[PDB]
């Protein structure tokens, strides 16, 4: 186990996460937000047809992007700092190119071809993009020309979101039949499948070494998992809470763990001693997605509040 | 001490934020008149004089929006988890091609007081209700229901459809269902749903302006 082996770890204390920066601006529900890579910029995706990337230091609006279709379920940000990636229901995976275009930011590829709604997208580099839809299957692509290069199958349900380990060469997937599967990016035979929930899994992210990951779900029972073991490793459950858990993201040290819930709190957890490490109130409504930086300096939450909040 | 060279870098944020908010202006001046159901649902003659689907039909000074999916118990997770702000559930239902009724029973048990869309407004239109008066006599609806506890007519039939929606409700009070007795389907329904959405926006005003 993890838990009965945790008999060596001295406790962590109580740390104030001070609510540093409050981001105004929106007018609707916000289904998605995600970072830059120099720990400074933040993409954000909300229901009213606009797409906003952000400079959290000086805290002012950098871009807002018109969509023609007003339905979002994801957006990703290329670690160059040139490509934003906005998804939707209508299977128009719209890749927009920021810097090199002069004035505008317009599409260069609408990856079309998914049958059902397009759930999650994540960038690798300026080359490809990994994507997940309602078509029970997922795919790696080639935006330089627009051919769906590789496509992997296996599930029996709609895919919800998708996740990388930052050495760029493995990916892991979550779909509504309580499935979390491993696929190597290049080959991708049906490697191994992960169960343990009963719910449609609604968030997953990876422990930043490249060796383990963790799943968050709306049956209020988060878990952590090895690359190899296929069974439960560490269970995460407030015994007094049965409203579910919407997003999840590890901190830089791997000592912490975020989780926003349905009762409008983000409990911060010790990643070691299975404790409520601290509490984040202040959300008007439900935490949609939370994001740690690439150095664990700040952390941020996007909710249904039409606001972003910056915790330190 | 930040008075240094970035007096465009915040000025840009004002220029983008005004045009950010003024997209919300011509948001919600419309409403969203959403097509639901299955085949034979009787919303083709509705959409006749009127991605997936939109439209832009207007009548008496109020531009409208309208969207479309179909095929319940698999299309549920779409709109419970990721729709929003619906003022119009057009639950058009086939009346001679069913089955798909406990479909509606467990669907309305799952939607009616769940935290995301407990505040839905489920409006049934028995489109081609002559097919319903034909179907209930060709087939007594005791095949679908144990607790058919009325007479042999249309009033208790349609009222019992309204029952068996909200028989799995079990803890709430009302929905105020605007059942257009749908005529020969080339019939004036635009005025019906017109002042129907007038009354739902009036009750949405009064729920949020003090007066009840």
């Amino acid at each position: 186990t993890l838990s009965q082996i945790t008999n060596n770890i001295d406790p962590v204390g109580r740390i104030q996460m001070r609510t540093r920066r409050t981001l105004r601006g929106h007018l609707a529900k916000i289904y998605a937000m995600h970072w830059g890579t120099d720990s400074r910029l933040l993409v954000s995706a909300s229901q009213d047809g606009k797409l906003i990337i952000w400079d959290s230091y000086t805290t002012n609006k950098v871009h807002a992007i018109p969509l023609r279709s007003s339905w979002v379920m994801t957006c990703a940000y290329a670690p160059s700092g040139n490509y934003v990636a906005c998804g939707g229901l209508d299977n128009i995976c719209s890749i927009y190119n920021l810097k090199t275009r002069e004035g505008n930011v317009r599409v260069s590829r609408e990856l079309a071809g998914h049958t059902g709604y397009l759930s999650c997208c994540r960038f690798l580099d300026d080359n490809q993009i990994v994507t997940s839809s309602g078509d029970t299957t997922c795919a790696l692509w080639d935006i330089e020309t627009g051919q769906q290069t590789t496509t992997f199958t296996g599930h029996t349900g709609d895919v919800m979101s998708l996740s990388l380990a930052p050495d760029t060469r493995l990916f892991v997937s979550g779909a509504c039949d309580a499935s979390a599967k491993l696929w190597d990016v290049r080959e991708g035979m049906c490697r191994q499948t992960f169960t343990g929930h009963e719910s449609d899994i609604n968030a997953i992210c990876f422990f930043p070494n490249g060796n383990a990951f963790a799943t968050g779900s709306d049956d209020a029972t988060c878990r952590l998992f090895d690359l190899r073991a296929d069974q439960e490793l560490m269970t995460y459950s407030h015994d007094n809470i049965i409203c579910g858990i919407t997003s999840v993201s590890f901190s830089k040290s791997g000592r912490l763990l975020l989780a926003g819930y349905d009762d409008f709190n983000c409990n911060v957890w010790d990643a070691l001693k299975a404790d409520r490490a601290g509490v984040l109130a202040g959300h008007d409504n439900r935490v949609s997605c939370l994001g740690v930086t690439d150095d664990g300096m700040a952390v941020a939450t996007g909710s249904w509040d039409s606001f972003l909040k910056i915790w330190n | 001490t930040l008075s240094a060279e970035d007096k465009a870098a915040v000025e840009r944020s004002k220029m983008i934020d005004r045009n950010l908010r003024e997209d919300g202006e011509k948001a919600a001046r419309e409403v969203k008149l959403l097509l639901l159901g299955a085949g034979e649902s009787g919303k083709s003659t509705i959409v006749k004089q009127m991605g997936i689907v939109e439209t832009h039909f207007t009548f008496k000074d109020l531009h409208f929006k309208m969207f479309d999916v179909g095929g319940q118990r698999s299309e549920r997770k779409k709109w419970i988890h990721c729709f929003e702000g619906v003022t119009a559930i057009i639950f058009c239902v086939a009346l001679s091609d069913y089955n798909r009724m406990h479909e509606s029973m467990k669907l309305f048990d799952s939607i009616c007081n769940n935290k995301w869309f407990t505040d839905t407004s489920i409006i049934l239109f028995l489109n081609k209700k002559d097919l319903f008066e034909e179907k209930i006599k060709k087939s007594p609806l005791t095949i679908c229901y144990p607790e058919y506890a009325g007479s042999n007519t249309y009033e208790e039939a349609a009222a019992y459809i309204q029952c068996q929606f909200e028989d799995l409700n079990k803890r709430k009070d009302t929905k105020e269902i605007y059942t257009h007795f749908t005529c020969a389907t080339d019939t004036k329904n635009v005025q019906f749903v017109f002042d129907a959405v007038t009354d739902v926006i009036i009750k949405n005003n009064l729920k949020d302006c003090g007066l009840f």
Partner: antibody
Amino acid sequence: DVQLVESGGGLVQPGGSRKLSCSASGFAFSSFGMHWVRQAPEKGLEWVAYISSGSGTIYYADTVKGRFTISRDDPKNTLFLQMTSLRSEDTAMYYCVRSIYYYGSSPFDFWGQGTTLTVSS
Amino acid sequence: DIVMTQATSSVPVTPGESVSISCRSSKSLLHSNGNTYLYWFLQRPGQSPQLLIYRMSNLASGVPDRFSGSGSGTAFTLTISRLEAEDVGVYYCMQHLEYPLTFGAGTKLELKR
């Protein structure tokens, strides 16, 4: 792609006035700021004027504050520069210069073809 | 106002070798934000100038990487790894700390024979 054609050069009688225009084409003229820059004969170059997005924020240099006028016409993509009280010490080639300002953004990164203004009898 | 300082004329460097040209400041141009706001311009004769180094540290679009910048808090120098036959011409320094902006004075890069 980008064409910044100046117009309005030539000879100007001293102390008089003149408007300049940069026919701008190929780039979204809204979200950019304009700079007027001047290059004298065999001298170091020098900043003159700034206009922002939103058509409001206006800056000048020392000698020509109050006598120059910078404006932009977004349906016409047009930088108007009305100069007044023109004297021999501004006989120069001028340029109109694209700008864009935010974090990780690149000011001045395009330049005009330039035009000649000459103040003499 | 704040004054930039150069050297006006310079040695024709041999085509094929490195070169370095300086410009320094009449005030500490580094602001508390973190990066000093300094500009290196190229102008060819009979042409219109494109920039080379924006904000003291970064090459621009359409410029090869031989234009390695060098910065103190106050003194600044652009170094070219190899003088090619087409980097001929006039160089300018121009700060961006406050308004208004003054520029440098110009420094010529020539050919040695």
